[PDB]
């Protein structure tokens, strides 16, 4: 048994989910790594094509879980799925999901998610498998099937797509964008940059690729998609299927003018998806935005797009010192107008206050049906008024539970290229 | 071994090798990360203790170039004496100024350690009632205060013994605002405070009931009885709460204390306990304009001012709360400089403490930091603290936190 309390309401719960964790959270009895972003390298199967030992007791566990699940364990059809997996372990070095479990792994990585504080949705997930797929072609039809259902004219909806499971290491298939859609970062003559700096590696191998770039702020990345190995390949998303929002405040009207502008759909696509010793190299998933990702962090960080003082100068504020605030009160204009402006195009989105609190009755759910949500208070905190949210007074529990979303190396550090 | 911290705005990185020379619990599991429980969770025998002071002496005498020193190997044998005679032992004042600062030094949740080693520190190890202890800290706040320039400074009353004569400061800090429960179930004053400011009017205090009482110290000395007493009014500076832009805002009433002196938590020293150490430095703004001003159940200002703002408050996503929020640490900040007493912004403190923890890195091998308590309680990610990788272990000497004395004191009188 272990306790989390709540330091404004002083609700304690008593978490025992733990006691199914996994994998190393990185720290130890003297050692706290909570505040390091990738504190872990422990894995549940060595790095490529695993033996009988290694890969038939991670499916045995996840298949046991699936039928617990569902009120089986032990049923017929438990025990021939444990035989099924071990004739194709035994006779190919993988095994194959049935599209039940696909979908119960997906929703569940998200469900044990303890960086994502969107998890009250959980459950609500479409799955589009298409682990049938053989080309960069098929994979740009699968995503843009994907931003088409997911965006929904702007009432988005959360969507996962499962492109085929890793094999031996070679035939890997990746989506090399870090989300679907994002903006290209340009290094300009002088020395200064162009668009959003994070992307500039990125944007560079596109052009290195073939890519005719505009050059200006807002230019959306092309997809590079990459297929069984294969060296990627580049394609246009249409622009139809790419909803941007402009940002304009509702008092000051000069904001506009600032002519900031963002997307509507977050899809990250760099992540792996591991269910039952499978690994899904190329699983974009994508659900709605909470504000403070674009008006604190995409905006206003300083190796972003790094806006504040521009804002600030268009405010007429006292920039001589720090003491003044100037940085926080243009920071909460911002955040207004990013607020105020997809809600008047009405494309979804959700202010950092509703979603904490939406966090913490999601909590208060996990520990009552499930006993417990891993959770990490690092990421789920917004970067803006933490103690004025209910989040920064609530203890949280971390813990490492599977299915999961794993970080992986981002491609171009091992493709060998053709 | 090495371990490695990166800061993900910078990409500076830092390699941490203090981290092998702690030995005490986190609370965290190789399982289970409890990186944000408050307290993740009685006198030592003589076996206990020669292995912690030794470790301690010989700390002491390597930071001051004279490990294996004749200094050092009769000091050792001579706190053996008193340990294997007494079942304890005393420090020297050299040591003792050493631990009090290194347990600053240590301390993972202070965003202010880069003036660790400019404190000051009052020996009060000879004091012996609860008139002394009252005298000790009147001197303290007067010395700390200095007409608004503030210094840190420690007071350090006797160690623990057998755990039944403990020196006790009741208070939570120096200087508090007390707060009264109404009969409609309205809070007056600090809601914080409800607790300790009954058992004050209980022992006798004859409360003026207004919002910003300043309470009274409770003082147990040697497993007493506490006892009651005034600050001098002089003593406690205080600041009267503006605006530089809204001539409103001085009509809310607001005031606040300039010195922030923590009074009860245990100062640990080489396996001794100083359950008496009130420590004082300055404040950060956001203390005072976020937590002790907007905390829902502090005083919780936010909806008056929002008010005063005629923003609109229906809905969440017109960011009111954090609108009204900067403007009140606008005016903490704005009147403390112009009162001319110390106080420092989290942008500055952050920065600051950015410029601490390399250093740190370089000529000690690390810096242990919690981050959950270093990042400020608002715009955490403007400020450089945030995209600051950190590892958090716990060192000695250290301050510790210890029950609440009401929960365990067993009274004498009647
Ligand atoms: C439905 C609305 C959702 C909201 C409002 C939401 C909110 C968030 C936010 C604010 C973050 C922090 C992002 C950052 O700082 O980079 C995050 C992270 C994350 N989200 Fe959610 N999320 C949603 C849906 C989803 C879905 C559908 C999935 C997967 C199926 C998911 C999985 C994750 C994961 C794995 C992370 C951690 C990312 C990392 O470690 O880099 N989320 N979420
Ligand atoms: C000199 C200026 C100082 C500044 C600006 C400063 C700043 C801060 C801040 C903002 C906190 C967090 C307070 C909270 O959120 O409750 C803190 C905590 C702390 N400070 Fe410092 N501090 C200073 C001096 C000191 C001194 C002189 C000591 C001891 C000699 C000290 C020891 C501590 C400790 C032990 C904590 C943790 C308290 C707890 O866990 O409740 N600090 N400091
Ligand atoms: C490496 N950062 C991960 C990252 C970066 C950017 C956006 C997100 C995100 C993802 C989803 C599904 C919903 C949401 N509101 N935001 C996550
Ligand atoms: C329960 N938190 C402890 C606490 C509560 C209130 C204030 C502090 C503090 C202490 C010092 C020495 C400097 C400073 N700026 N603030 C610490
Ligand atoms: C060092 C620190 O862990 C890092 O900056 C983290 C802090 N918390 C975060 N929280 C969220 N949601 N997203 C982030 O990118 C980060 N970055
Ligand atoms: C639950 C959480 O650990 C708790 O609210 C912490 C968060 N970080 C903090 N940080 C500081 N400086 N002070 C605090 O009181 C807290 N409270
Ligand atoms: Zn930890």
Same mark, same amino acid.
Request: aromatic letters at 12%.
């Given at each position: ?343 008047? !195009?009405? #494309?979804? /989105? =959700?202010?950092?206050? +509703? ?6 009755? %999601?909590? $208060? ?10 959770? !990490?208070? #690092?990421? /789920? =905190?917004?970067?803006? +008024? ?6 920064? %007074?609530? $203890? ?23």
């Amino acid at each position: 048994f272990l306790k989390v309390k709540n330091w404004e309401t002083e609700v304690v719960l008593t978490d025992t989910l733990h006691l199914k964790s996994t994998l190393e959270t990185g720290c130890t009895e003297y050692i706290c790594m909570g505040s390091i972003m990738h504190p872990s390298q422990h894995a549940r199967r060595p790095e490529d094509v695993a033996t009988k030992d290694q890969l038939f007791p991670l499916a045995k566990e996840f298949i046991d879980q699936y039928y617990s699940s569902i009120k089986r364990f032990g049923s017929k059809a438990h025990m021939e799925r444990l035989e099924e997996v071990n004739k194709e372990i035994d006779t190919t070095s993988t095994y194959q999901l049935k599209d039940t479990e696909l979908i119960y792994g997906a929703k569940h990585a998200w469900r044990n998610a303890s960086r994502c504080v969107g998890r009250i949705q959980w459950s609500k997930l479409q799955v589009f498998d298409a682990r049938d797929c053989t080309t960069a072609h098929g994979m740009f039809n699968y995503i843009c099937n994907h931003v088409k259902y997911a965006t929904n004219k702007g009432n988005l909806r959360s969507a996962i797509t499962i492109f085929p499971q890793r094999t031996d290491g070679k035939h890997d298939f990746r989506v090399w964008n870090s989300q679907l859609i994002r903006y290209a970062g340009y290094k300009q003559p002088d020395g200064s940059t162009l668009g959003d700096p994070a992307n500039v590696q990125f944007t560079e191998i596109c052009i290195q690729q073939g890519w005719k770039p505009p050059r200006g702020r807002f230019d959306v990345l092309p997809l590079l998609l990459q297929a069984n190995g294969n060296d990627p390949e580049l394609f246009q998303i249409p622009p139809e299927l790419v909803l941007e929002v402009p940002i304009r405040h509702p008092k000051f009207e000069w904001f506009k003018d600032l002519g900031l502008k963002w997307y509507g759909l977050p899809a990250v696509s760099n992540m792996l998806l591991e269910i039952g010793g499978l690994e899904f190299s190329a699983c974009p998933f994508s659900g709605w935005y909470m504000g403070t990702e674009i008006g604190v962090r995409d905006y206003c960080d300083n190796s972003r797009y790094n806006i504040l003082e521009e804002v600030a100068k268009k405010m007429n504020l006292d920039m001589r010192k720090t003491s003044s605030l100037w940085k926080d009160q243009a920071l909460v204009e911002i955040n207004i107008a990013v607020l105020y402006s997809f809600q008047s !195009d009405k #494309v979804t /989105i =959700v202010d950092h206050h +509703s979603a904490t609190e939406s966090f913490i009755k %999601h909590m $208060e759910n996990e520990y009552r049906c499930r006993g417990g949500c891993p959770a !990490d208070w #690092v990421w /789920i =905190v917004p970067p803006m +008024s933490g103690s004025i949210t209910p989040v920064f %007074h609530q $203890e949280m529990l971390n813990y490492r539970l599977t299915p999961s979303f794993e970080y992986q190396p981002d491609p171009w550090n091992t493709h060998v290229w053709k």
